[PDB]
């Protein structure tokens, strides 16, 4: 079989064995024994800006593994793509959208 497959199974098996020791040996007991408040908008912004910048950085990864062919024409277009995304970053820096300062 492939090494990747046998590796995932082995990691899976080790996890089962460590779990089994807890179930087999560790002590067990049958006895296993409402408000509202606004949440900070900051939590939304952290995932929002991450999601957008993560996509933009992702779109740049193909350029890095194709630079010999993209060359000067590709560099130019990738710089125009960098500049547009940077201007959006300066906007979140300008409005302290992250509400960190």
């Amino acid at each position: 079989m492939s090494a990747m497959s046998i590796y995932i199974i082995f990691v899976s098996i080790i996890a089962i064995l460590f779990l089994a020791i807890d179930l087999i040996f560790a002590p067990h007991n049958p006895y296993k024994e409402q408000s509202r408040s606004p949440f900070n908008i900051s939590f939304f912004i952290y995932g929002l800006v991450f999601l957008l910048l993560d996509l933009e950085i992702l779109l740049l990864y193909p350029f890095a593994v194709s630079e010999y062919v993209n060359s000067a024409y590709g560099l130019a277009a990738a710089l125009i793509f960098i500049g547009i995304i940077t201007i959006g970053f300066v906007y979140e820096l300008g409005h302290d959208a992250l509400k960190v300062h």
């Binding site: 509202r36 939304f44 929002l48 999601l51 996509l55 779109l59």
Partner: protein
């Protein structure tokens, strides 16, 4: 055949939904995944890298609508206090 099944699932998410407006966000994304997966499988069948590029741009627009949508849902919640439809 898997791509059509998942497109039904997203569609049936709208068929079976009277109260969840969150589940309509989820069902839109299942429909986008089915359409991107169809383009991706037909791309491998025709040796065309342009299908992979179109799939990538559908993933970017899909995330951008998720951001625009969950932001509007946050604006709505701030004043309403519930995301529930009084049915």
């Amino acid at each position: 055949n898997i791509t059509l099944i998942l497109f039904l699932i997203g569609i049936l998410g709208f068929v079976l939904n009277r109260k969840n407006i969150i589940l309509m966000l989820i069902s839109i994304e299942i429909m986008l995944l089915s359409i991107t997966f169809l383009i991706l499988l037909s791309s491998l069948n025709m040796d065309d890298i342009i299908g992979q590029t179109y799939a990538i741009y559908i993933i970017v627009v899909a995330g951008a609508e998720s951001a625009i949508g969950l932001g509007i849902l946050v604006a709505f919640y701030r004043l309403r206090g519930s995301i529930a439809i009084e049915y």
